[PDB]
A paper describes a structure:
FdlA from Flavobacterium sp. SA-0082 is an endo-type fucoidan-degrading enzyme that cleaves the sulfated fuco-glucuronomannan (SFGM) through a lytic mechanism. Our structural, biochemical, and enzymological analyses strongly suggest that FdlA-NTD utilizes catalytic residues different from other β-helix polysaccharide lyases, potentially representing a novel polysaccharide lyase family.
We first measured the enzymatic activity of 12 mutants and found that eight of them (D137A, K141A, H176A, F179A, E236A, R240A, Y242A, and Y242F) almost completely abolished their activities, H279A mutant retained approximately 65% of the activity compared with WT, while mutations of Asn243, Arg272, and Tyr322 to Ala only negligibly affect their activities. In addition, both glycosidic O atoms between −1 and +1 subsites and the carboxyl group at +1 subsite are hydrogen bonded with Tyr242, implying the essential role of Tyr242 for FdlA-NTD catalysis. Tyr242 in the substrate binding groove is located at the edge of the alkaline pocket. This arrangement, together with our observation that the pocket is able to accommodate a trisaccharide unit, strongly suggests that Tyr242 directly participates in cleaving the substrate to produce trisaccharides, and the alkaline pocket assists in orientating the polysaccharide substrate into a position close to Tyr242. Furthermore, we found that the inactive mutants failed to exhibit significant structural changes compared with the wild type, which is consistent with our CD results.
Residue numbers in the entry: 1 to 442
């Protein structure tokens, strides 16, 4: 009942068919610039457009090598290597690697998942080729950039009930590793997600070289010269819900926020954010995850984070995004450091909003002197200095349960009120808020 094909040329017709069971024979397949043309195999982008429904595609032992020059062969248009438009499709075990580091002419997304009830399982994806690469988002991630960009993202989850399962996503590109736009009930489960880091001091050492950052005198889009002392990711989000977007389901174009995301048992390493879902609506659930060396650990806005862990070497494990945050319930383990501490944010957590139930657990005995649990106050975060992103800093906290089962100190700012604090040690808790309760525990 399974059709096996032995070339990308013979694969493509099946992508336009419904109810097919297709296997691409074990082997290596190469997509290079010569392969993209009007009379060539890849006439249009997306390269692999899964338009059919109710189909299964097996890519076991398939290595698909896509030369990044392909990202420049479609004019000034977005290039997507893989897009699923149908429903009830299963794609499994493909190994996809972006070859070379050539930047996209405009922008690129390796995999885009529209439709409903699709699953991508067991993929191994390596993302390469973007501009600028080496600065993170310091000189622009959207419009009005200090340095113009050609972003390359990895997996874009849209549609309805679409599922990313047991995948490895390695990024060496300036883009989100895994993100959700206009997605209803997306689920990310069992995935390993990894980017790479670079200190702002290393960036600043480009002074005099004529680098692109050197030529703008390191003036960031946040309004100030790039500060030393921070560790940045070269990628954007690890698992992120975008603000708003467009998806396609059953020939219906839909503009909406992401809603009801679920993230289960994922390890995220060296991204801008471990798991950030504050922009998603509906029920948010994050369970069993590990976040290592990210600039921020967990920021889902509201919902549940349970049985999760983050280390604190490069940024806070937990951040309330806005003062409008409400009903954030979290049980987070501060993991032992995966590398030396280089956390310029001067906080292991920033807590604000109202009606939160927060538990922090750790075995760490050696606490860096700048690391503190903050309830309200002026976070020294890289992107919120000197009034930048003002809704994400300097906001009040009210009616919050804080169970500090850690040796980390707690600072309650004067904008904090009705904070119920239990801690291993209350001697390192400073309270300048209103009607805060502070009880020690064994």
């Amino acid at each position: 009942q399974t059709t096996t094909v032995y070339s990308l040329e013979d694969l493509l017709p099946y992508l336009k068919q419904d109810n097919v069971d297709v296997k691409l024979a074990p082997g290596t397949y190469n997509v290079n610039g010569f392969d993209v043309g009007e009379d060539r195999l890849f006439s249009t982008t997306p390269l692999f457009l899964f338009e059919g429904s109710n189909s299964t595609y097996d890519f076991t032992d398939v290595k698909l090598n896509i030369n990044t020059v392909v990202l420049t062969k479609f004019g000034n248009n977005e290039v997507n290597e893989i897009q699923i438009l149908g429903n009830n499709n299963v794609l499994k075990n493909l190994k996809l690697e972006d070859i070379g580091t050539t930047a996209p002419s405009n922008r690129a997304q390796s995999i885009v998942i529209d439709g409903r009830d699709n699953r991508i399982e067991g993929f191994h994806l390596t993302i390469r080729g973007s501009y600028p690469y080496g600065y993170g988002d310091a000189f622009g991630k959207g419009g009005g950039s200090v340095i113009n960009h050609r972003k390359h993202s990895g997996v874009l989850i849209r549609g309805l009930r679409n599922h990313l399962k047991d995948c490895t996503i390695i990024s060496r590109s300036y883009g989100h590793i895994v993100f959700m736009q206009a997605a209803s009930y997306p689920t990310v489960e069992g995935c390993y997600i990894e980017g790479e880091m670079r200190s702002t001091d290393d960036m600043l050492a480009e002074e005099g070289t004529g680098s692109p950052a050197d030529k703008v005198d390191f003036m960031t889009v946040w309004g100030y010269k790039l500060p030393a002392g921070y560790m940045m990711s070269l990628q954007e989000g690890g698992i992120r819900a975008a603000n708003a977007g467009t998806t396609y389901i059953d020939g219906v174009e839909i503009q909406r926020a992401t809603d009801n995301p679920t993230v289960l048992n994922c390890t995220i390493k060296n991204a801008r954010t471990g798991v950030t879902l504050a922009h998603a609506n509906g029920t948010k659930y994050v369970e069993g995850c590990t976040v290592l060396g990210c600039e921020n650990g967990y920021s889902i806005g509201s919902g549940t984070v349970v049985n999760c862990g983050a280390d604190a070497i490069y940024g806070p494990v937990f951040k309330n995004t806005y003062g409008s945050d409400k009903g954030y319930n979290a049980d987070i383990t501060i993991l032992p450091p995966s590398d030396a501490y280089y956390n310029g944010h001067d906080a292991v957590a920033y807590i604000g909003g109202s009606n939160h139930n927060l538990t922090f657990r750790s075995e760490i005995t050696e606490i860096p002197s700048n690391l503190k649990i903050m309830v309200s106050g002026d976070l020294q975060g890289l992107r919120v200095l000197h009034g930048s992103n003002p809704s994400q800093n300097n906001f009040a906290g009210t009616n919050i349960v804080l169970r500090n089962l850690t040796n980390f100190p707690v600072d309650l700012h004067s904008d904090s009120s009705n904070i119920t604090v239990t801690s291993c040690d209350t001697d390192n808790i400073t309270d300048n808020g209103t009607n805060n309760s502070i009880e020690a525990i064994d």
